Design a protein around this ligand. Structure first.
Ligand code: COH
Ligand code: COH
Ligand SMILES: *[C@@H]1O[C@H](CO)[C@@H](O[C@@H]2O[C@H](CO)[C@@H](O[C@H]3O[C@H](CO)[C@@H](O)[C@H](O)[C@@H]3O)[C@H](O)[C@H]2NC(C)=O)[C@H](O)[C@H]1NC(C)=O
Ligand SMILES: *[C@@H]1O[C@H](CO)[C@@H](O[C@@H]2O[C@H](CO)[C@@H](O[C@H]3O[C@H](CO)[C@@H](O)[C@H](O)[C@@H]3O)[C@H](O)[C@H]2NC(C)=O)[C@H](O)[C@H]1NC(C)=O
Ligand SMILES: *[C@@H]1O[C@H](CO)[C@@H](O[C@@H]2O[C@H](CO)[C@@H](O)[C@H](O)[C@H]2NC(C)=O)[C@H](O)[C@H]1NC(C)=O
Ligand SMILES: *[C@@H]1O[C@H](CO)[C@@H](O[C@@H]2O[C@H](CO)[C@@H](O)[C@H](O)[C@H]2NC(C)=O)[C@H](O)[C@H]1NC(C)=O
Ligand SMILES: Cc1c(Cl)cccc1Nc1ccccc1C(=O)O
Ligand SMILES: Cc1c(Cl)cccc1Nc1ccccc1C(=O)O
Ligand SMILES: *[C@@H]1O[C@H](CO)[C@@H](O)[C@H](O)[C@H]1NC(C)=O
Lengths: 551, 551
């Protein structure tokens, strides 16, 4: 297969022509030639003027005084934010194209929502090497890579100051659209909403939703334990959950996502968001004493969706980016732009989001420490301390650095191995191919990748060729930005996926984005004034201080 | 419920506040005020310069010499076609909003693909009248509406000269996205693709597709009978069809759409498209001897989707419109425009497409006449005469006029009544509410509507108030355009749904509209040179002349 070498540059589409030849489709690439590598004139001007992402990053993370001014000039701030959204979004094909089973456009690949979609097509089945033509005939042993490059010896804290509130928010939020269907395989998902539909609160199916709802005042079922609201049980709802046999029945909390009983940190956010829904129901009832249970429920969900997108953009990504420029959730920024209000979750987005180096060696709640053996699947811990103590504790506890290598806790070691193995089962192209796909220069050496001599040597001994290095391992050992949680590739590849999932949500479309959609101005304002602090403040006893970084 | 009166004008959203008050959301409507009735400064100017659709239609259906020149000036033709697409599309909400069960925006209504979507929300339940406030407490008897207004007395042929090739193409083509799920209710569909996916050729599910495919050379299973290609049998495929018990095994033809055994006219087009699929397979195999069965099949399907959209726009709609301006299928026209590449089938689009007055009193194949008892479920007629004769016969037979009233054949009289009854089940707003929704002046009397005295008198006797006339009956009794098949409302309501379904298709998006998507320039050219004539010419023996109008 002549396309095995990935001849076509700059998004050119490769097509076999006979058995020994290929043809590159250069349509609207800005290039031409046999391999789409010759630039047209305006492309040359664009490339000459375009600053490197590391330069843009430097500028956005320095000159605080300058950004303080920009931030307070709405006209400028809006123009910048608008540019951030459209420029990054252009990197995503929407409607989607490839999946694990199709390296060419097909109706199956487009129409079948059970697949994760693909930013780069799978490597053809009949290639001389598993990645195309580069690297050895067999990839390095999964376990070797994990042990040599990814396994944590000494905990490395995040220099950006990310805390456990950030880590569990990341896990909680993303697990509404990262829902791998392992019955089928890693290529498939159970999140057919393909974005931020809050199914991890309300359930994927209507049947599950009905089990969780109270059908009074639009609210969700709950328990009152030690004076506070908690989610209901499997018994009361009949909504299935993943729990080991050890967990007693009355501790088997039931929420939207079946897996959120895994850790108390997830059950914390599930608890918090449950309280928010029922709180919003109270608000809306005051506004609409004439509304039935149905409209109260639905309208609350639309509000909580807006709250989610609001918080993610202006607190989560804000913290995550390190930018002094103040990000803004404002759908109106895009109303005069070309933009597709739809999304399909990319498998590569799932892969890059395996941020298990965030996880600590032990979890500190109040004044007690828990190892993984006793923290996992233990909801009594949650009842023992209550939500307030959890927020105060997690806000103070530092998370680990994601990039930089050797920071995956031994407890979730096999998870890292599974993330590598599943990439290969899904025929991912190389790390350098994904760099080029997102307009980054490919790395020329292993030492260039890590910015260091030790790991780069293990990399060379394992891979031999820099173009044979795989996506997921490379992301975690890549040289971090200066005092940053991530390296260049994580950000430039991840950001476009993220923004498409956030702004591509239906509520951001002009027909939806208006007061009447959310029950009037009061409801509309709950979205537009939402923050991670106000979320905690409204639903957590005592209204503790919280933030995505440690004080 | 104060919103029962539909107080909010110009796409403003009505919302109840307390038990006795309403609110109008005027956001981006171009109007303000209590009922969104007062135009903004810009809106005044636009309104003053906007010509009436009847004027636009006059211009487009006159000045033949002028349009002949415009059609040959690519610059002008493109600009005009571009405007047609963009202007008509702004009238559809995309992503979709309401459905039968939700007259307010909700995630259930957006996300649940099993519903037909709604252009206007359902009349709320506890309303003074079925339509809102207008009309009597009880709607007129539906069978009385049919006999008095819709039932054919003498056959009225279409002045635009539409033939049976047109009639059966309309039925065949639209029945891929009009797939009402009657075991669930009129408000639901089985066509989850919600557009032009050719599921009526390939099957809705992968399981059905697999029964119909040959899994050799990308082809679909088939029979050779009398030296000609026909669809395979139910026995050979195990693909379920709807056939009454009398139909013998060997005449039970199996195709994508379960119901296409209903009439030989449908099965005619099913046969022609099946032939086209396997013809394209042969073309692609020549272009790509290295390709496997799967890629050959998928690429053919995408080409046939391209052919379908091409033919619908440039032959079907072309004839339908009566326009002298030459409509163009060209996705490139929208690449610099705002446009959503997605669609959701509207229940109202389904309703307005019940063009059963098209049907003749008898079906004349060759020198034979067939009544409905003889013609329906009778594929023996298809084998007896063959496809060539069917084309020759349907091309020469005239269809009936749709607007103007009293032209529904007695044979499908109950289908007409079903349309009315089912629309009442789904709680459609009045005919005049739908006029306003698509920027038409509401009719001030029954005479203005029908442009006639008998039926207008019949309508007032049944409805009393012109604002109480229902959607479906009004569409059929409406004053046609001069020597036109349709009245104003059918066109101005229908065209947006149609274009949105056609151009909203994924293959029209810039990522897809590439020769590489369709196997190269040859495959690409099949799409861009397709016509109803070339479809027949390529797959019908003798290459008979055909057209959507009678000679
Ligand atoms: C982004 C942050 C994040 C965090 C903080 C986090 C924190 C934790 C955590 C906290 C104590 C524990 C016990 C685990 C344990 C697991 N996680 Co993560 N996970 C995270 C992102 C993910 C993602 C994404 C997946 C796979 C998604 C999928 O396909 O279901 C995942 C998968 C897993 C799996 C199964 C992977 C497989 O079978 O292939 C286990 C087990 N994990 N994780
Ligand atoms: C647009 C042209 C068109 C034509 C030419 C046509 C020609 C014919 C025809 C020719 C001999 C016959 C016997 C019928 C008979 C029927 N049609 Co039409 N139909 C057409 C458009 C439709 C549409 C649209 C529907 C409803 C779609 C749905 O929901 O399935 C329909 C529905 C029906 C139904 C189901 C009604 C119900 O279940 O309540 C029957 C039966 N019919 N039709
Ligand atoms: C899209 O909306 C459909 C209509 O609401 C919905 O179908 C409904 O699904 C529910 C639950 O799946 C069915 O519930 C009935 O059956 C259960 C079975 O145990 C019983 O508890 C009750 O008898 C209950 O009434 C509804 O019957 C069904 N309604 C219809 C008209 O089909 C779909 O599930 C929705 N689609 C998605 C993807 O959520
Ligand atoms: C989206 O793609 C999925 C993967 O191809 C597909 O799942 C596949 O569906 C087929 C057809 O139902 C299954 O067929 C197998 O099961 C039947 C059951 O009787 C048996 O005859 C055979 O053993 C047959 O192999 C596949 O097993 C199944 N594959 C997987 C991995 O789940 C979905 O159906 C597609 N979605 C849609 C809407 O079409
Ligand atoms: C789950 O966490 C709880 C903490 O709330 C653990 O329960 C404590 O166990 C110690 C020693 O067994 C007792 O002295 C405490 O009184 C317990 N606390 C409560 C509130 O009952 C429990 O051991 C943990 N479960 C696992 C499997 O580690
Ligand atoms: C279905 O169509 C066939 C014709 O294709 C009808 O069969 C004909 O019936 C007449 C009178 O009954 C005979 O004189 C012909 O010899 C038959 N021709 C063939 C080819 O069978 C048949 O009657 C039709 N079915 C119905 C129910 O009317
Ligand atoms: C969006 C964005 C900007 Cl603008 C800058 C910097 C980062 C992001 N985002 C992300 C980047 C990488 C991985 C995940 C994300 C995420 O948002 O979830
Ligand atoms: C699109 C269009 C134009 Cl531009 C003019 C005139 C007619 C149409 N179309 C339609 C109008 C009414 C009902 C159906 C259709 C259809 O196309 O199926
Ligand atoms: C395109 O790439 C191929 C490698 O497959 C190379 O042999 C050829 O010289 C390249 N063509 C150009 C114009 O760079």
């Amino acid at each position: 297969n002549p396309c095995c070498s990935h001849p076509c540059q700059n998004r050119g589409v490769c097509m076999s022509v006979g058995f020994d030849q290929y043809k590159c489709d250069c349509t609207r690439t800005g290039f031409y030639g046999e391999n789409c590598s010759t630039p047209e004139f305006l492309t040359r001007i664009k490339l000459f003027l375009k600053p490197t992402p590391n330069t843009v990053h430097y500028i956005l993370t320095h000159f605080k005084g300058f950004w303080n001014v920009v931030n307070n000039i709405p006209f400028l701030r809006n123009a910048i934010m608008s540019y951030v959204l459209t420029s990054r979004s252009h990197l995503i094909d929407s409607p989607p194209t490839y999946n694990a089973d199709y390296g060419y456009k097909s109706w199956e690949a487009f129409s079948n929502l059970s697949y994760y979609t693909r930013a780069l097509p799978p490597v053809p089945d009949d290639c001389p090497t598993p990645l195309g033509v580069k690297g050895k005939k067999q990839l390095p042993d999964s376990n070797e890579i994990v042990e040599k490059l990814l396994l944590r010896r000494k905990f490395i804290p995040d220099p950006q100051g990310s805390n456990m509130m950030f880590a569990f928010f990341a896990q909680h939020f993303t697990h509404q659209f990262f829902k791998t269907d392992h019955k089928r395989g890693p290529a498939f998902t159970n999140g057919l909403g393909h974005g931020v539909d809050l199914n991890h609160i309300y359930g994927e199916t209507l049947a599950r939703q009905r089990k969780l709802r109270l059908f009074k005042d639009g609210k969700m079922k709950y328990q009152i334990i030690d004076g506070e609201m908690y989610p209901p049980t499997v018994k009361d709802t009949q909504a299935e959950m993943i729990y080991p046999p050890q967990v007693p029945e009355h501790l088997r909390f039931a929420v939207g996502q079946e897996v959120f009983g895994l850790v108390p940190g997830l059950m914390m956010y599930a608890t918090i968001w449950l309280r928010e829904h029922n709180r919003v129901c109270d608000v809306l009832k005051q506004e609409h004493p004439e509304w039935g249970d149905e409209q109260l429920f639905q309208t609350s969900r639309l509000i909580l969706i807006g709250e989610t997108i609001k918080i993610v953009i202006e607190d989560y990504v804000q913290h995550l980016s390190g930018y002094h420029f103040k990000l803004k959730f404002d759908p109106e920024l895009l109303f005069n732009k070309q933009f597709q209000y739809q999304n399909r979750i990319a498998a590569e987005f799932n892969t890059l989001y395996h941020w298990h180096p965030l996880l600590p060696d032990t979890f500190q709640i109040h004044d007690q420490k828990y190892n993984y053996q006793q923290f996992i699947y233990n909801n009594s811990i949650l009842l023992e301390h209550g939500i307030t103590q959890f927020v105060e504790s997690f806000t103070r506890q530092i998370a680990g650095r994601v990039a930089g290598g050797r920071n995956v806790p031994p407890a979730v070691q096999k998870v890292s191995q599974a993330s590598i193995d599943q990439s290969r089962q899904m025929k991912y192209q190389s790390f350098n191919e994904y760099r080029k796909r997102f307009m980054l220069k490919p790395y020329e050496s292993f030492e260039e990748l890590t910015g260091e001599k030790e790991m780069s040597a293990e990399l060379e001994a394992l891979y031999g060729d820099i173009d044979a290095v795989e996506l997921y391992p490379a992301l975690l050992v890549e040289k971090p930005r200066p005092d940053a949680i991530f390296g260049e590739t994580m950000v430039e590849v991840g950001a476009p996926f993220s923004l498409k999932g956030l702004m591509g949500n239906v509520i951001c479309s002009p027909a939806y984005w208006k007061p009447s959609t959310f029950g009037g101005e009061v409801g509309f304002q709950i979205i537009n004034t939402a923050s991670i602090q106000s979320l905690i403040c409204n639903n957590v006893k005592g209204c503790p201080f919280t933030s995505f970084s440690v004080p």
